[PDB]
Symmetry: C3
Subunit: 262 residues, 3 copies
Amino acid sequence: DPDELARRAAQVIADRTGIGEHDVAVVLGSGWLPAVAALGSPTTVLPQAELPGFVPPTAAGHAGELLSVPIGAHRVLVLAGRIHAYEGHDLRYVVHPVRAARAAGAQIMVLTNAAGGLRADLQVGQPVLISDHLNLTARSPLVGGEFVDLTDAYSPRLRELARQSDPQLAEGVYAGLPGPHYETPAEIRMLQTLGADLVGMSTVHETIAARAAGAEVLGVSLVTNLAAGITGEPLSHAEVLAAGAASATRMGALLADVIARF
Amino acid sequence: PDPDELARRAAQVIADRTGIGEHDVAVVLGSGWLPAVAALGSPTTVLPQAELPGFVPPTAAGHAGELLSVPIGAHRVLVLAGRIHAYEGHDLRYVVHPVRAARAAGAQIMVLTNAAGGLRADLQVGQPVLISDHLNLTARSPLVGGEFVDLTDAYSPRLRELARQSDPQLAEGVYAGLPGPHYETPAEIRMLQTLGADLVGMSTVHETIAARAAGAEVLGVSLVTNLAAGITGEPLSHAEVLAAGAASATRMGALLADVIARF
Amino acid sequence: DPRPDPDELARRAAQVIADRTGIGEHDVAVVLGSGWLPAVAALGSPTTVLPQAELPGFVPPTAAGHAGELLSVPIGAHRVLVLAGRIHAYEGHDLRYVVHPVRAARAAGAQIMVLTNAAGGLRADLQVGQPVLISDHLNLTARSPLVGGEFVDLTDAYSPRLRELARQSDPQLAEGVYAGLPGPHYETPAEIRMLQTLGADLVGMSTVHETIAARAAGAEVLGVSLVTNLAAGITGEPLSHAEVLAAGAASATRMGALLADVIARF
Ligand SMILES: O=c1[nH]cnc2cc[nH]c12
Ligand SMILES: O=c1[nH]cnc2cc[nH]c12
Ligand SMILES: O=c1[nH]cnc2cc[nH]c12
Ligand SMILES: OC[C@H]1NC[C@H](O)[C@@H]1O
């Protein structure tokens, strides 16, 4: 039962942070990890591996951390380092952070990710709010039949608050694929025809579990490269890494400023 | 252990318990269709699915539905009131087992029904729609190994013709089968329109494939319980979806009975 | 972490292959598509033939029966590994088994993989019996044979250079985008219209994972489809494996002769 496990995690977080409950959670994906320090200095820093349900028993190594950071008047749970579906782990582990945070009282989830840009106006290094998504993984983190509507899965209200911080923020449709491989140029032309503006390898399941758990969602992509076949040249791993490293401080500041308005 | 073997074993229990050697037609009632049972016709036999070989997975449980034996016209029909979807996490063998068991019990025609969101402009809530073809978007198949089944005319034009003889105004449409259990985003719905879908659901495709692989004809019927996500400008309503299925239950059952009678 | 380890198994299979064939390393590997079996002879006289069942990592423990063979064939100045028989994802086994032949071949020295298949034709000009080079693909399986975070760019996954060489062999060769679906069932007419909208010219039940694994392992790939039928709904006639096998046998000698002449130019 994912619910009872998130419940236990929430209890551990409360006792380890001294904070009765948190209000917001932020998931830092690829291209957003170096922006952690910019969100604010943490009051508590604890390894995900020491928290119930975060890391699967078999496969291991060293998970990220879970930070408790005060931002504005909020107590924010910051997840630095997520476990991906491409490793083969059940999706309950992928969405556990969201479920635990909700159990911890978090009602807003800020989900970030690295993404390839498909719409012509999007540039490398540009953060883009997610207006909607295309779940192209043929999976779901939900088991059983509860009713879960995904209309406005990415709260228009929260996107409006984000624009108070930066009125020029672009908005677009994110396509979530299984990965880990990047797409062929043919696949990118396909995604374009399907209405995708951004392409990535995460986030969709977290959004679904979030909405199912009663939380609002703000998604933010960092365009780390133009999608395959667009430039006429192969992708550059170096560029993808630099996109995240360079905008680190700027991205951390933006998120803190936005979250403060929540 | 074997899928076909379990189907045969199930057919045997069905035969003995219903007192009917073979059933000519099988009906799988989808979400929202349950209350149509009475209008379909009173059963002569009712047996718990949990008491039939192969119907329930080992681990996850609780209590499955019922299997009905109903005389309709000059036919003996197996009516499955309660199914298990792929989104429930079980191997597809359990999802299509009712179809294979029905075939083993003699069913040559499978009538597969379901609840679906409507994408084509002319479709209205409460409208039954004949499935003309499907888009299997689950990235899966209930077939394992080299079972290369042709899916041209998967939904018998013959049976669709008979259905129209019952109601000449019945519309047809392409059904998009997704994994579920979450409903779609407006963007996903726009994507489905581009791909040629008229209806969107969370079942049926695997049942259709298994039916065809087993050599049975298929009539597909969707009940539009809501307009697809992003079309009304308002969020989907669980209350309204459920209200829609109950509201058209009697009408759906009566429709099914008249069409089947023509087989 | 996962046991067995893909790369360890590939290297061990390479060693077995080297000892059994008496050849230290091979230069090219050919994976034969379904229906293409009778084309093996056309490729050339084998110096070594061995059961795939006698090679580590090729056959899953549970499900069995009898796998194909692996042949060592000299083609031009090349020592070529020919895989007559393979396993597809629809058989239900981990993709590790689907791409192991490619990984084993690379570990054996092959830096060029020639992946062949039977496909339904969707683009109007492609005809039954026509060999088509694969220019790109659409992986519609929602899976990947990769489980690590390594950066893998699929741009030019099907080497433009190799397609250039294939055309020096046959300047008439057409090219097309191949859509790989899970199978084993064939497509409905509606799904075929959908694939056409997505940009697919050919449709099949293999190849995509092999290509991805090959690119990840550092090998170039030349993809070759044999149109064995027009995709569902085009002719209004139902498809059949028999039909596919028929086209495969009918073009066997021509396909093998073509592969041989193209590989000779590598
Ligand atoms: O181009 C891309 N495709 C898929 N995922 C990512 C993540 C960053 N860039 C990309
Ligand atoms: O809108 C819908 N989407 C997917 N499945 C169903 C089943 C009933 N309505 C819907
Ligand atoms: O039409 C087809 N669809 C899928 N696979 C194949 C393989 C040969 N022909 C086809
Ligand atoms: O006839 C169908 C088979 N041939 C090619 C497909 O991949 C499948 O294995």
